[PDB]
Structure formats: structure tokens, C-alpha cells
Design a protein around this ligand. Structure first.
Ligand code: NP2
Length: 118
């Protein structure tokens, strides 16, 4: 269509733009701990270290209704899942690598769609 790769302004465009990212983040090998919502016990203290609980189980649920149509909105949620994940799980299990891996692909994806916030 056009020759642009950094302007997720329109909601209709950013709509599927995030759908593709979330769609991949869900199919990504590193995306189990986010698929299922982590209770407030199975995790090494969660209600305490986590002030803004967030999981892929609720993200796609909101995306389907076009809830993320801005920039830091979707970028914040995704980061919330990875950043908060490591926060509760000490850098020792394999979950740490999963977030870092899916977090790397995510950053690259928004770079291709034009998301990114900083
Ligand atoms: N399988 C339930 C969601 C992931 N489980 C979980 C729960 C709490 C803490 C960490 C993990 N985890 O690394 O899979």
C-alpha cells in the first residue's frame, strides 16, 4: 500500500497492528506464563511485588473489542506482562528467559509496525 513503517495513529490500522503482535506473542514459544492468569499464590508473592497484574489472558480479551488504540496503551500492557513477570520470578527459573525472549521479539515487532513509545 504505502511506504511507511512508523505511524500507528489511526485506530483501524493500529487495531490489527496490535492483533498481529498479540497474535504472535500468544503463538510465540515463550508465552505460557502469560496465557494463563497467575493466581496470587502459585507465584513467589504476587499481590505484593505486582501492583498492576496483567496477563495475555486479558490482553487479547481487550484487543478483540478494540480497547488498545493509541501507542503506550498496548505497549504498556505487553511490558506489564514481561516486566512484572521477571519482577516476581527471580532470575533463576526458565520463565525469566521466556519473558526476555518474547520481550525481544515484541520490541522488534512494534519496530516493524511502528508502535514503540519510550
Ligand atoms: N501455569 C499457571 C501460569 C504460570 N504459572 C506460574 C504461576 C505463578 C508463578 C510462576 C508461574 N510460572 O513460571 O509458570
Amino acid at each position: 500500500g504505502s511506504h511507511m513503517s512508523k505511524e500507528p495513529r489511526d485506530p483501524d490500522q493500529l487495531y490489527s497492528t496490535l492483533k498481529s503482535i498479540l497474535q504472535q506473542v500468544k503463538s510465540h514459544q515463550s508465552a505460557w506464563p502469560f496465557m494463563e492468569p497467575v493466581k496470587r499464590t502459585e507465584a513467589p508473592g504476587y499481590y505484593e511485588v505486582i501492583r498492576f497484574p496483567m496477563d495475555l489472558k486479558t490482553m487479547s480479551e481487550r484487543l478483540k473489542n478494540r480497547y488498545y488504540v493509541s501507542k503506550k496503551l498496548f505497549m504498556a500492557d505487553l511490558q506489564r506482562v514481561f516486566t512484572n513477570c521477571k519482577e516476581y520470578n527471580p532470575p533463576e527459573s526458565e520463565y525469566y528467559k521466556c519473558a526476555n525472549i518474547l520481550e525481544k521479539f515484541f520490541f522488534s515487532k512494534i519496530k516493524e509496525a511502528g508502535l514503540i513509545d519510550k
